[PDB]
């Protein structure tokens, strides 16, 4: 169809990217990854990756999308048809990401529902699901006494199984919460995402205000000083392992949602001559600042918990994705009328995650319909396609909300869409653009659209800095490989690790496979075939 959509105003583009940027990756993923990696040792790789690859690649996606009015898949048909597999790899990343990203909001919805109560269940462990080993953290410091908050998170919400080999029963309450969130996502996407007028003044601003309140509460705690010292002081010895390097790298590639197709899709709606350099840098600063500021709140709470319980900071909570659900409720318990603040906090989590999810789903649909604009035209066809995609994603998320679903979630988070695949996709993007497509040609394209060249920082980052960082972490991770462990105590079965690698390979292998498919479908000799496919076709 001739029709192609565009933003009605630049504010819409800014809001869409801000909603895509700020979400569970900042307030939930960054705190637990830093806690797992030992605090300060996580930051040095983080800032290296950020100012080295993070922002330049984010500008790369937006400016590629703006240059070619196409989705994540069909954009590469004009830069490099031979390397069109990057778009397929990105969408597979998006498809896998949407399955497990929603489950966090399912946990938040369950927490939100179980906060409509006279007293918060995690304020004491006199409840049924609690073990006799429990002792109130107010008296834990006065042989393996445990906190009630951790007990609620594990026994009640997760109903944690002894291992992934024991899936157990399917949590009906989590399934209905999983369904409710997906129904919200469908009804907000089946027609089209919109700012909806003045409601943005509440949807967008509220999460930052709530985070500020949590930051004030955390820094005012008696043991905040020790937590901040652990957060900021680097452990140089930890840099001798690839874990801190890979975790910091893929976190940025995940938080910025750049290896995904959403950023290209959002850029595709921009005007050709639109100036977005300043906006991209400011939005990146907002995302990085939000994560760094939220880190202070989380670790201040953890420092207070360590001081109260008498245990070390590294041993005070879970070294896994459950850190947010163990730390933030605890801080809420230390506030007047804890029910009110818990309600606002989990509404804050839903608002941050739903806005990001809407961007991810909308980008996935936009990239997919670009392949078949006529068959997937607007109207009934799009509504059916969205309904089918949401239903399949719902059924795919159902396996990780069981008793042993936490291990499946951890496997998905580490390997699928948030691990080596981000390094794989990012390296090929910069390699094609800087070397095969031509850095000088792309700078000319950037100048034609923005009016100014990208500059030495962006050119060198695409040409050298990003490829070197991606390859180095790839080699370092593969040469010093260590297996994945849940909560640093559970060893995954060899088949579970193979499944995780297969999940990673499902996206990584898209690049070589499509290259073979593209090459084999082109007639003539090999040299002519590659020459044609390297030339912009569409």
């Amino acid at each position: 169809p001739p029709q192609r959509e565009k933003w009605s105003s630049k504010i819409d583009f800014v809001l869409s990217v801000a909603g895509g940027f700020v979400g569970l990756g900042n307030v939930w993923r960054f705190p637990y990854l830093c806690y797992k990696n030992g605090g300060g040792a996580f930051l040095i790789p983080y800032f290296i990756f950020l100012f080295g690859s993070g922002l330049p690649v984010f500008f790369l996606e937006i400016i590629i999308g703006q240059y070619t009015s196409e989705g994540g898949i069909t954009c590469w048909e004009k830069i490099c048809p031979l390397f069109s597999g990057i778009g397929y790899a990105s969408v597979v990343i998006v498809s896998l990401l949407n399955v497990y990203y929603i489950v966090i909001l399912a946990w938040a919805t369950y927490y939100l529902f179980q906060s409509f109560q006279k007293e918060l269940p995690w304020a004491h462990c006199n409840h049924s699901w609690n073990t006799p080993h429990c002792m109130e953290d107010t008296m834990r410091k006065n042989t393996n006494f445990t906190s009630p908050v951790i007990e609620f998170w594990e026994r009640n919400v997760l109903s944690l199984s002894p291992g992934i080999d024991h899936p157990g029963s399917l949590k009906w309450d989590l399934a209905l919460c999983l369904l409710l969130v997906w129904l919200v996502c469908f009804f907000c996407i089946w027609k089209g995402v919109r700012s909806t007028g003045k409601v943005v003044y509440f949807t967008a601003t509220f999460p930052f205000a709530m985070l500020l309140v949590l930051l004030v509460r955390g820094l005012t705690l008696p043991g905040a000083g020790a937590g901040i010292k652990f957060y900021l002081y680097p452990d140089i010895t930890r840099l001798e392992d690839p874990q801190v390097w890979i975790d910091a790298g893929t976190q940025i590639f995940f938080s910025y949602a750049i290896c995904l197709g959403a950023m290209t899709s959002l850029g595709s709606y921009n005007k050709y001559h639109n100036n977005v350099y300043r906006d991209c840098m400011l939005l990146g600063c907002l995302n990085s600042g939000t994560s760094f500021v939220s880190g202070f709140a989380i670790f201040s709470i953890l420092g207070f918990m360590a001081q109260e319980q008498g245990v070390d900071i590294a041993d005070v909570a879970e070294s896994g994705p459950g850190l947010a659900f163990i730390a933030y409720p605890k801080a809420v318990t230390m506030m007047p009328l804890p029910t009110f603040w818990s309600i606002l906090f989990f509404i804050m989590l839903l608002l941050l995650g739903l806005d990001s999810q809407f961007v991810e789903v909308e980008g996935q649909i936009t990239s997919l319909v670009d392949l078949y604009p006529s068959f997937l035209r607007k109207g009934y066809r799009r509504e059916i396609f969205i309904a089918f995609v949401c239903s399949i994603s719902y059924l795919l998320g159902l396996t990780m909300v069981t008793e042993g679903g936490m291990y499946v979630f951890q496997l998905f988070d580490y390997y699928a869409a948030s691990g080596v695949c981000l390094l794989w996709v990012a390296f090929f993007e910069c390699f094609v653009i800087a070397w095969i497509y031509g850095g000088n040609r792309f700078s000319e394209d950037i100048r034609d659209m923005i009016g100014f060249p990208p500059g030495p920082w962006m050119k060198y980052s695409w040409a050298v800095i990003t490829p070197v960082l991606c390859v180095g972490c790839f080699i370092f991770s593969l040469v010093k490989y260590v297996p994945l462990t849940y909560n640093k105590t559970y060893v995954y079965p060899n088949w579970a690790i193979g499944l995780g690698w297969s999940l990673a390979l499902s996206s990584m292998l898209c690049v070589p496979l499509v290259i073979v498919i593209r090459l084999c479908q082109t007639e003539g000799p090999f040299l002519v075939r590659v020459k044609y496919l390297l030339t912009p076709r569409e």
């Epitope: 001559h273 100036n275 000088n440 700078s443 000319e444 100048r447 034609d448 009016g451 100014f452």
Partner: antibody
Framework: EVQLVESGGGLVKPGGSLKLSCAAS????????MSWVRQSPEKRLEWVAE????????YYSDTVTGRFTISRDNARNILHLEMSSLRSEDTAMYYC????????????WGQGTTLTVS | ENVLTQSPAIMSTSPGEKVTMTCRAS???????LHWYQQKSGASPKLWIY???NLASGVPARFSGSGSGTSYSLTISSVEAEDAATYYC?????????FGSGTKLEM
């Protein structure tokens, strides 16, 4: 350091053709966008055409879109402007400008050469 | 075409007073896409102010610029000798590029 000097100009019959040139020195000519601006005897500046930093994107004024042509010589670092049909209103002095950054404008200008019609 | 117009055709003032000049645009232009050029009476033009506030390298800074939307202006704190020249405002936001009608200071 940066210097621009134009060459080529004289009397032509109406409807004739003449090719102008612009030499560059002191900078990487293959990295900066170039534009032609002409000043009529009435002293009014009129933009003519622009060639991108690599010569892939080209823009023309509405009045010279069908008769004028802008081109580059990156190896020789010389900018060429070719006219296929010089009308009576084409008499002016043509200036070579180094308009690379649109946010900064024509920061450098050449000496200029005059063109007249009989 | 976004035709640019300057209100004063010609100006003459004593070399001890401030003067002001305006540039009106037929369409709204970004603050970063309009520049002022100073042309000596007998030589080539020269970039004077760009981005509506950034003074060029060679300007004594005795100049200043302000504006937004479709109305723009340039100002001089106190004009001295050799300041008499023709000043052109230029649109650089969209093609075709347009220069103002030109305005000349005298005496």
């Amino acid at each position: 350091e940066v210097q621009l000097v134009e060459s080529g100009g004289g009397l032509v019959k109406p409807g004739g053709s003449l090719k102008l040139s612009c030499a560059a020195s002191g900078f990487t000519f293959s990295s900066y966008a170039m534009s032609w601006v002409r000043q009529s005897p009435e002293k009014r500046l009129e933009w003519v055409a622009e060639i991108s930093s690599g010569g892939r994107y080209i823009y023309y004024s509405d009045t010279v879109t069908g008769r004028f042509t802008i081109s580059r010589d990156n190896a020789r670092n010389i900018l060429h402007l070719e006219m296929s049909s010089l009308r009576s209103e084409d008499t002016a002095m043509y200036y070579c400008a180094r308009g690379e950054v649109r946010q900064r404008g024509f920061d450098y200008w050449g000496q200029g050469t005059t063109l007249t019609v009989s | 075409e976004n035709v640019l117009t300057q209100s004063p055709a010609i100006m003459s003032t004593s070399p001890g007073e401030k003067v002001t000049m305006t540039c009106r645009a037929s369409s709204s232009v970004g603050s970063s896409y309009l520049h002022w050029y100073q042309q000596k009476s007998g030589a080539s033009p020269k970039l004077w102010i760009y981005s509506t506030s950034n003074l060029a390298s060679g300007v004594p800074a005795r100049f200043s610029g302000s504006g937004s939307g479709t109305s723009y202006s340039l100002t001089i704190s106190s004009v001295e000798a050799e300041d008499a020249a023709t000043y052109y405002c230029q649109q650089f936001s969209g093609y075709p590029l347009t220069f103002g009608s030109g305005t000349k200071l005298e005496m």
